[PDB]
Scaffold this active site. Structure first.
Site: not given
Ligand SMILES: Nc1nc2c(ncn2[C@@H]2O[C@H](COP(=O)(O)OP(=O)(O)OP(=O)(O)O)[C@@H](O)[C@H]2O)c(=O)[nH]1
Ligand SMILES: COc1cc2c(c(OC)c1OC)-c1ccc(SC)c(=O)cc1[C@H](NC(C)=O)CC2
Ligand SMILES: Nc1nc2c(ncn2[C@@H]2O[C@H](COP(=O)(O)OP(=O)(O)O)[C@@H](O)[C@H]2O)c(=O)[nH]1
Ligand SMILES: [Cl-]
Ligand SMILES: [Mg+2]
Ligand SMILES: [Mg+2]
Ligand SMILES: [Mg+2]
Ligand SMILES: [Mg+2]
Ligand SMILES: [Mg+2]
Ligand SMILES: [Mg+2]
Ligand SMILES: [Mg+2]
Lengths: 422, 439, 340, 54
Positions: B10, B12, B99, B140, B206, B254
Site C-alpha cells: 500500500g 503508507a 482497494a 497501514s 500517526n 531475538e
Molecule cells: N505515516 C504514513 N501514513 C500514511 C501514509 N500514507 C497513508 N498513510 C495512512 O494510512 C492510511 C491510508 O492507507 P493507504 O496506505 O493510503 O491506503 P492503501 O493501503 O494504499 O489502500 P488503498 O488506497 O485503498 O489501495 C491512513 O490512515 C493514512 O493516515 C504515509 O506516507 N505515511
C-alpha cells in the site's frame, strides 16, 4: 481508477454540462480549439481524468451529448466551447420528449439509446482504467429525466462494477415549466435510488433563492442558475481533477460518503457566492450556512451522516483545521455520534475563474428528506385525482408503476428519518 | 550471514519504504546509483549489511525488497525518483485499480488476482538467499491494500515460508492524518486475520508522530514526508542490529524471544528520543540520562498511552552514538527511583541494552537535526491495550447500525467476519487485562 | 462556547458545577457519549481514561485523577503507606492497619495484637471495607471471610463539651491540572449528639462518626448545632475557651501536613504535566483528633459530597481554579495553597 | 542492580542489566474462503443481471 466518461442528457443536462466544460477547461488551461496554453503543471497532472489526448497535443473532453431534439445540442455547438467536443459524440433524435418521462424512458428514448451506448462503449474501450460515469440532467423534463435514467440502467447492465455518479436538477414551482414535473421527478428518484452510487441534489428552488435573496436578482435566467451549478460542479470534482494531497477517485468518495446503499443523495454548497478577498473563518461559516446550500433544505432540521469539504486557494492549512473543528465541535448536535470522524477536509492550491480562494461543501444530511417530501406532496396532490395521467398511460404505462414510485420515495424519506433519530 | 526480505504494501508501506531505504543507503554509504566505495568485496562478501542488500558483479547494491500496491502512482514515484537505479524493475509491482479503503476489496476481490504474482517475486528474492531469517512487512491499518492484501500475504507467507519470522511495522489510523471513515473496520479486520501469523508488530500511531513533529520540530502542518522521515529513524534504530555488526537484537528471533512472552501479546511500544529541530542549529547536546528519561515520557512514544497504568513484560533499550554502559547504568538507576516502572510478577524486571557507536544519520536538508546520541526503547507494556480500546469503540459505534457494511458485503465478505474479528479483539483486550492487573 | 459532558447523575458537587457552568453563558452540555468535549464530568467507576485526549483540536479535561483510587480505597491506602519509601516507618499520623482477605496479612496482624494483650494499652480494633467493632479477634473474622482492613480504634478521642461526645473532621482538597494542592478554608466536623460510651464493648451508636448513620440510629439530632455539623468559626472558639489553643495551631498544621504527604507520594504516578489529557479532582480527607490534640488520618474520599451551605462557595472555587484555569472566560482566595 | 553478559566489537557493545528477580490454517482453507467470496460476488451479480433483464 483513472478515466471518467461524462454524459449529458436533455436541455438542462446539456446547458449545465456545457458550462461545466467551460469552467474546467479554463482551470486546466485548455482553449476552445483544444490546445493547452497554461502556466502551471499541478493542470496537466490529472488532465486525462476528463480529457482524451489526440495528436498535436489536443485535449478533447470524454463527453457524450444526448438529446431527443436537436435544438439544444445545436446551441451547444454554436456556443463558445462548441468546437472542443467530438463531432460523432453528438447523439440526437428529432421527435423530442414533450416533458414526458414515459417518452424518454420507454418509447422515444428507446430508439436512440443504442446509439448513445455505442459512443459510451467506444470511449470506455480506449480508457486505460475506467473509474465510472457522471451524468448531468434534470428530473422534471422528459429526455434527461426519462432517457437519462434508462441510460443509467443500461450502462449498469454493461458496466455493473463501475461507479455511477449524477448531477440531478430537482424541479420547483418557482422555476417550473410544466405541471407534470413531480411525476417525472418521482419516477426518476426511484431509478436513482437503485442505480446510482452518488447523486448531487441540485434544487432549482435553492438556486433561485440564492439568486433572488443575497446576490439580489429580481429576474434570474437559467444562465444565472447555471453559474452556481458550474461553480459547484467544479468544486466537488476538484479532488478528482487536481493532484490534491488527498487520494481521490469516485469509489473512495462513495465508500466514505455513503453509509447505507440507498442513502446517497448529497446536499452540495459553495462559498463565496459569485457573479475582494475572503478569510478562512468567513468561508467556513458560509459553506455550512443554509443560505449557501444548493438543495432547499435546512440542515438544522436533520443530522449529518457524512460531510466533505474542499477548500481551494493558497491559505493556511492550520487555520482551515481550526475553523473546521470550530464549526464541527461546537455544532456537534447536528452530526451523528455513531459515525466517528465523519467530516473530512481537502485543500487544493489552485483556486477557481476569478477568485483568490473558495470552499465547496458536500453533505449527506438527513434533512434532504425535506426535498423528497416536497416532491411527494406535489406528486400526491395530482395523483389522488389521476390528473395528467393520460399523457403517461397513452405511452403504455399504468397506475401501478406510479403507485410503486410513490411508495419507494416515501420509504426513502422514512429511511432518512430512521437514522436521524439514532 | 542470514538475509532479511522487506515487503512494502500500500501507499503508507511504499512511502515509508522510500524513507527507510533512503536512510539505510546514507548509513552504509551506498550511493543512489548503487555503488558502495567502502565495500571492497565485489559481487558478494556476506558482511552484516548484506542481510538487507544483495550485490551484482557490476558493483550495484540491491535492496532485498518488494514494493506492492494495487495502483501505480505511488510506486511510479519510486520508478521516477532518486533511487530508481537502486531497485530492479521486478521488485516493483503495481495493479490497475485500488482497494478504495475497503479490506474486503483488497483481501478478496483484487488481492486474489495479484497474490500469485507477488509470491513469485518474493520467491525470486528468497531463491537468492543462502540463509533467510524472515520478513519485514510495512503497511497501514486503515488502507484497503494495507489492511486487505497484507493479511492475505501474511496468510500465504505462513504456508509458503512456515518456519520463517514475520515482523510488522503497522501504521495505526489517526483522524489528523485524514483517514477514511471506515478505517476502524479495516484495522480490526486485518488485525484479526494477521494475529496468528505475525511474530512481532511495531504499531505507529500517526497521532503521536504528527504531534511529535508539531511539538519538537516546530512544524505548522506535518506532511507525510515529515512523518516518514521520523518513522524511518525508529525503523532504522530497530533494524540497525540486523544491518550493523553487534551482539544484541542481532537476529530477528531475538526480538521475539526478548519482547514477546505470550505469542498473541506481540505489540511492543516504541519510544524514541531525542527529536530535535534543524533550526536549532546549535543545540545543547542531550546526555544519556536525559534521553533515557525521555523514553518514559508519553510525549515521545509511538502510540499515545500511559505505561504508568499497566505492567512491563519486557523492556529493551537501543542506543545509537556516543554511549557507554556506565552512562546507561547511571541513567537507569536515577530513573529507577523517580519513575513508577511496574513490572509483572512473573518476569525479571530488567533492561536488555544495545549500543551501536555509529550515530544516527539524517537526510541532508531534513527537518530532523544531526545528534551525537539517541535511543529507541522497545517495551512490551499492557498500556498499549488503550490503543485497541479506542479503535474497538469506533468500530462498535458504526457496527451497531451496520454503517458502511454493505461495501464489504458487496465484495463477498460476510457479517459474521465482522463479529468474529471483533470478538478476537474483545479477547485480546481481555488478555491484556489478565496480564496487566493483580485482579 | 466551551463544551462539557455529564456522566455522573447523582454527583451533588458536579451537578452544581454543571448548573454554575451554564450560568456563565459560555459553557453548554452535550449528550454523555459525545466525544467532542472540552471537559468530562466523568462516572465514578470505570471512567474511560484511555479514550481521552485523542480527539483532534480539543484540549480535554476530566474531574478524576487516574490511579487516585490508590489513595481513596481503604485497602490500597494501607498498602501504599506501608510499601512507600517516603511514608512508612517515618509516618506516625496513620493508625497502623492490617489487610485481611476472604498474599495476605494473617501472619502480621497477630504480631502486634499479642504484646498489647500482655500490657495495659487496650486492644480494640475496628473492621471495615473499601461496619463492625470488637476487642476480640474472633467476633470480627466471621463476616469478613465471606478488600477488607482492620484499623487501630482510637480509644482516647477528643471530647466536645457539654456532653463528652465524639467527632470526625472533613476537609476538602482540590488538586488542579498543575498539581497545585488547594485546601478549602471552611471544613466541617461530623459530630455525634449522643454522649461517648467507654466500658460498653458492644454498642455502635456514638462510636460511629457519620452524619447519615447518626440520623437513623439517633433521634437526638442536636439543638446546640444543626444538624450534626460544626464549622470552623465555632470549633476554633471552643478550643480557645476550653483548651487555650486555636484551630490553626493545635489541629490545622497537622491536617495540611497529612494532605501534603499523601498527595506528594502519588504525584509521579498520577500527574498529567506532559500528558495528552489534563485532569483535576476534589478529595475529601477524613480526620480524627485524640485527647493530646494529635490528628489521625482515617479515610480519603475520592468522590465526596459537600455540606449544604458550603456548596455555593466551594463549587464556584472549583470552576475558578480548576476549570477556568484551563478554559478562561471573558478575590479573596477561598483556598489555602499547599506546596507542592 | 548488576550487569550480565556484556559483548563488544568495533561497531558497538551490548549487555543486560537485571534489577529484580522473577517469581493454524492451511492452503486449502485459504483458497476455499477466497473462492467462497468470489461465488457470493457472482451470486449478487447474477441476481442483479436477472433483475435488470426483468
Ligand atoms: N505515516 C504514513 N501514513 C500514511 C501514509 N500514507 C497513508 N498513510 C495512512 O494510512 C492510511 C491510508 O492507507 P493507504 O496506505 O493510503 O491506503 P492503501 O493501503 O494504499 O489502500 P488503498 O488506497 O485503498 O489501495 C491512513 O490512515 C493514512 O493516515 C504515509 O506516507 N505515511
Ligand atoms: C474524490 O475525492 C475525494 C476523496 C475522498 C473523500 C472526498 O470527499 C472529500 C473526496 O471528494 C472531494 C473523503 C470524503 C469524506 C469523508 S467523511 C466520512 C471521509 O471520511 C473520507 C474521504 C476519504 N479520505 C479523506 C482523507 O477525506 C476518501 C477520499
Ligand atoms: N438549473 C437549470 N434547470 C433547468 C434548465 N433547463 C431546464 N431546467 C429544469 O429542468 C426541467 C425541465 O427539463 P428539460 O431539461 O427542459 O427537459 P428535457 O430536455 O426533456 O430533459 C424543469 O423543471 C426546469 O426547471 C437549466 O438550464 N438550468
Ligand atoms: Cl520454511
Ligand atoms: Mg419513431
Ligand atoms: Mg446496436
Ligand atoms: Mg423544457
Ligand atoms: Mg492506495
Ligand atoms: Mg560485500
Ligand atoms: Mg508463524
Ligand atoms: Mg465488486
Amino acid at each position: 481508477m483513472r478515466e471518467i466518461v461524462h454524459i449529458q442528457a436533455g436541455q438542462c443536462g446539456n446547458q449545465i454540462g456545457a458550462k461545466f466544460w467551460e469552467v474546467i477547461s479554463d482551470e486546466h488551461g485548455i482553449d476552445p480549439t483544444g490546445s493547452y496554453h497554461g502556466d502551471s503543471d499541478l493542470q496537466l497532472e490529472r488532465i486525462n481524468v476528463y480529457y482524451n489526448e489526440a495528436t498535436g497535443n489536443k485535449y478533447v473532453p470524454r463527453a457524450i451529448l444526448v438529446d431527443l431534439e436537436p435544438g439544444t445540442m445545436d446551441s451547444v455547438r454554436s456556443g463558445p466551447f462548441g468546437q472542443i467536443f467530438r463531432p460523432d459524440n453528438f447523439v440526437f433524435g428529432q421527435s423530442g420528449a414533450g416533458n414526458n418521462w414515459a417518452k424518454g424512458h420507454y418509447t422515444e428514448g428507446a430508439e436512440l439509446v443504442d446509439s448513445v451506448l455505442d459512443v459510451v462503449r467506444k470511449e470506455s474501450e480506449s480508457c486505460d482504467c475506467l473509474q465510472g460515469f457522471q451524468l448531468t440532467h434534470s428530473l422534471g423534463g422528459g429526455t434527461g429525466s426519462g432517457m437519462g435514467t434508462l441510460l443509467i440502467s443500461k450502462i449498469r447492465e454493461e458496466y455493473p462494477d463501475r461507479i455511477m455518479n449524477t448531477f440531478s436538477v430537482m424541479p420547483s414551482p418557482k422555476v417550473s415549466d410544466t405541471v407534470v414535473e413531480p411525476y417525472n421527478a418521482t419516477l426518476s428518484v426511484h431509478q436513482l435510488v437503485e442505480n446510482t452510487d452518488e447523486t448531487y441534489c441540485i434544487d432549482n428552488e435553492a438556486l433561485y433563492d440564492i439568486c433572488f435573496r443575497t446576490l439580489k436578482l429580481t429576474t434570474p435566467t437559467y444562465g444565472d442558475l447555471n453559474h452556481l451549478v458550474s461553480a459547484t460542479m467544479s468544486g466537488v470534482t476538484t479532488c478528482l481533477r487536481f493532484p490534491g494531497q488527498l487520494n481521490a477517485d469516485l469509489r473512495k468518495l462513495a465508500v466514505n460518503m455513503v453509509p447505507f446503499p440507498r442513502l446517497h443523495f448529497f446536499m452540495p454548497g459553495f462559498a463565496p457566492l459569485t457573479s475582494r478577498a475572503l478569510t478562512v473563518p468567513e468561508l467556513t461559516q458560509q459553506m455550512f450556512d443554509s443560505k449557501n446550500m444548493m438543495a432547499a433544505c435546512d440542515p438544522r432540521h436533520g443530522r449529518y451522516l457524512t460531510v466533505a469539504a474542499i477548500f481551494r486557494g493558497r491559505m493556511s492549512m492550520k487555520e482551515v483545521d481550526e475553523q473546521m473543528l470550530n464549526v464541527q465541535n461546537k455544532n456537534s448536535s447536528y452530526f451523528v455520534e455513531w459515525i466517528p470522524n465523519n467530516v473530512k477536509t481537502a485543500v487544493c492550491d489552485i483556486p477557481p475563474r476569478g477568485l483568490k480562494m473558495s470552499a465547496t461543501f458536500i453533505g449527506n444530511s438527513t434533512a434532504i428528506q425535506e426535498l423528497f417530501k416536497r416532491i411527494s406532496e406535489q406528486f400526491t396532490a395530482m395523483f389522488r385525482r389521476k390528473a395528467f395521467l393520460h399523457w403517461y398511460t397513452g405511452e403504455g404505462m399504468d397506475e401501478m408503476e406510479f403507485t410503486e414510485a410513490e411508495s419507494n420515495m416515501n420509504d426513502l424519506v422514512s429511511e432518512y428519518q430512521q437514522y436521524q433519530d439514532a | 550471514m542470514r538475509e532479511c526480505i522487506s515487503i512494502h504494501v500500500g501507499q503508507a508501506g511504499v512511502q515509508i519504504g522510500n524513507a527507510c531505504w533512503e536512510l539505510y543507503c546514507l548509513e552504509h554509504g551506498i550511493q543512489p546509483d548503487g555503488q558502495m566505495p567502502s565495500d571492497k568485496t565485489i559481487g558478494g562478501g556476506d558482511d552484516s549489511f548484506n542481510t538487507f542488500f544483495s550485490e551484482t558483479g557490476a558493483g550495484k547494491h540491491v535492496p532485498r525488497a518488494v514494493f506492492v500496491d494495487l495502483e501505480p502512482t505511488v510506486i511510479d514515484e519510486v520508478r521516477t525518483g532518486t533511487y530508481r537505479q537502486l531497485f530492479h524493475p521486478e521488485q516493483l509491482i503495481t495493479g490497475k485499480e485500488d482497494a478504495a479503503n475497503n479490506y474486503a476489496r483488497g483481501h478478496y476481490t483484487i488481492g486474489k488476482e495479484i497474490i500469485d504474482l507477488v509470491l513469485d517475486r518474493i520467491r525470486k528474492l528468497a531463491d537468492q538467499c543462502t540463509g533467510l531469517q524472515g520478513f519485514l512487512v510495512f503497511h497501514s491499518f486503515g488502507g484497503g491494500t494495507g489492511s486487505g492484501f497484507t493479511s492475505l500475504l501474511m496468510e500465504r507467507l505462513s504456508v509458503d515460508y512456515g518456519k520463517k519470522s514475520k515482523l510488522e511495522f503497522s501504521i495505526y489510523p489517526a483522524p489528523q492524518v485524514s483517514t477514511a471513515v471506515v478505517e476502524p473496520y479495516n484495522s480490526i479486520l486485518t488485525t484479526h486475520t494477521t494475529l496468528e501469523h505475525s511474530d512481532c508488530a511495531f504499531m505507529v500511531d500517526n497521532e503521536a508522530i504528527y504531534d511529535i513533529c508539531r511539538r519538537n520540530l516546530d512544524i505548522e502542518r506535518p506532511t507525510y514526508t515529515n512523518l516518514n522521515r521520523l518513522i524511518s529513524q525508529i525503523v532504522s534504530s530497530i533494524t540497525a542490529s540486523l544491518r550493523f555488526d553487534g551482539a544484541l537484537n542481532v537476529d530477528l528471533t531475538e526480538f521475539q524471544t526478548n519482547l514477546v512472552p505470550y505469542p498473541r501479546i506481540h505489540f511492543p511500544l516504541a519510544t524514541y528520543a531525542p527529536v530535535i529541530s534543524a533550526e536549532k542549529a546549535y543545540h545543547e547536546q542531550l546526555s544519556v540520562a536525559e534521553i533515557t528519561n525521555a523514553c518514559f515520557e508519553p510525549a515521545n512514544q509511538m502510540v499515545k498511552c500511559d505505561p504508568r497504568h499497566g505492567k512491563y513484560m519486557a523492556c529493551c533499550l537501543l542506543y545509537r552514538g556516543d554511549v557507554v554502559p556506565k552512562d546507561v547504568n547511571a541513567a537507569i538507576a536515577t530513573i529507577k527511583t523517580k519513575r513508577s516502572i511496574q513490572f509483572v510478577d512473573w518476569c525479571p524486571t530488567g533492561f536488555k541494552v544495545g549500543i551501536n557507536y555509529q550515530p544516527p544519520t539524517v537526510v541532508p536538508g531534513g527537518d530532523l537535526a544531526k545528534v551525537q546520541r539517541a535511543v529507541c526503547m522497545l517495551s512490551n507494556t499492557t498500556a498499549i491495550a488503550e490503543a485497541w480500546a479506542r479503535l474497538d469503540h469506533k468500530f462498535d459505534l458504526m457496527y451497531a447500525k451496520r454503517a458502511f457494511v454493505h461495501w464489504y458485503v458487496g465484495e463477498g465478505m460476510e457479517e459474521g467476519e465482522f463479529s468474529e474479528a471483533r470478538e478476537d479483539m474483545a479477547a485480546l483486550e481481555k488478555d491484556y487485562e489478565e496480564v496487566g492487573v493483580d485482579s | 462556547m466551551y463544551t462539557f459532558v455529564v456522566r455522573d447523575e447523582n454527583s451533588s458537587v458536579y451537578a452544581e458545577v454543571s448548573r454554575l457552568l451554564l450560568a456563565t453563558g459560555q459553557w453548554k452540555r452535550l449528550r454523555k457519549d459525545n466525544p467532542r468535549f472540552n471537559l468530562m464530568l466523568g462516572e465514578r467507576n470505570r471512567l474511560p481514561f484511555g479514550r481521552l485526549g485523542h480527539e483532534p483540536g480539543l484540549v480535554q479535561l476530566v474531574n478524576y485523577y487516574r490511579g487516585a483510587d490508590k489513595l481513596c480505597r481503604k485497602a490500597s491506602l494501607v498498602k501504599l503507606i506501608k510499601t512507600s519509601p517516603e511514608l512508612s516507618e517515618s509516618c506516625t499520623w496513620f493508625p497502623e492497619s492490617y489487610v485481611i482477605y476472604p498474599t495476605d496479612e494473617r501472619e502480621v496482624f497477630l504480631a502486634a495484637y499479642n504484646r498489647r494483650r500482655e500490657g495495659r494499652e487496650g486492644n480494640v480494633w475496628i473492621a471495615k471495607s473499601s461496619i463492625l467493632i470488637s476487642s476480640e479477634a474472633s467476633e470480627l473474622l466471621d463476616f469478613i471471610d465471606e478488600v477488607h482492613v482492620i484499623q487501630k480504634y482510637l480509644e482516647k478521642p477528643l471530647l466536645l463539651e457539654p456532653g463528652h461526645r465524639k467527632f470526625d473532621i472533613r476537609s476538602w482538597v482540590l488538586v488542579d491540572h498543575l498539581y497545585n494542592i488547594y485546601l478549602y478554608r471552611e471544613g466541617v466536623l461530623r459530630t455525634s449528639s449522643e454522649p461517648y460510651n467507654s466500658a460498653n464493648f458492644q454498642d455502635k451508636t456514638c462510636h460511629l462518626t457519620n452524619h447519615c448513620i447518626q440520623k437513623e440510629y439517633s433521634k437526638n439530632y442536636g439543638r446546640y448545632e444543626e444538624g450534626n455539623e460544626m464549622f470552623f468559626e465555632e470549633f476554633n472558639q471552643y478550643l480557645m475557651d476550653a483548651l487555650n489553643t486555636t484551630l490553626e495551631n493545635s489541629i490545622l498544621l497537622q491536617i495540611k501536613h497529612i494532605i501534603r504527604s499523601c498527595l506528594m507520594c502519588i504525584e509521579p504516578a498520577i500527574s498529567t504535566k506532559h500528558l495528552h489529557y489534563q485532569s483535576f479532582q476534589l478529595f475529601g480527607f477524613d480526620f480524627m483528633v485524640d485527647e493530646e490534640l494529635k490528628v489521625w488520618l482515617i479515610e480519603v474520599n475520592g468522590a465526596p459530597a459537600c455540606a449544604q451551605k458550603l456548596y455555593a462557595e466551594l463549587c464556584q472555587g472549583i470552576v475558578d481554579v480548576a476549570i477556568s484555569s484551563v478554559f478562561p472566560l471573558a478575590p479573596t482566595s477561598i483556598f489555602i495553597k499547599l506546596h507542592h | 542492580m548488576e550487569v550480565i553478559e556484556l559483548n563488544k566489537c568495533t561497531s558497538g557493545q551490548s549487555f543486560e542489566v537485571i534489577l529484580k528477580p522473577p517469581s493454524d490454517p492451511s492452503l486449502e482453507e485459504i483458497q476455499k474462503k477466497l473462492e467462497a467470496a468470489e461465488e457470493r460476488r457472482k451470486y449478487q451479480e447474477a441476481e442483479l443481471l436477472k433483475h435488470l433483464a426483468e
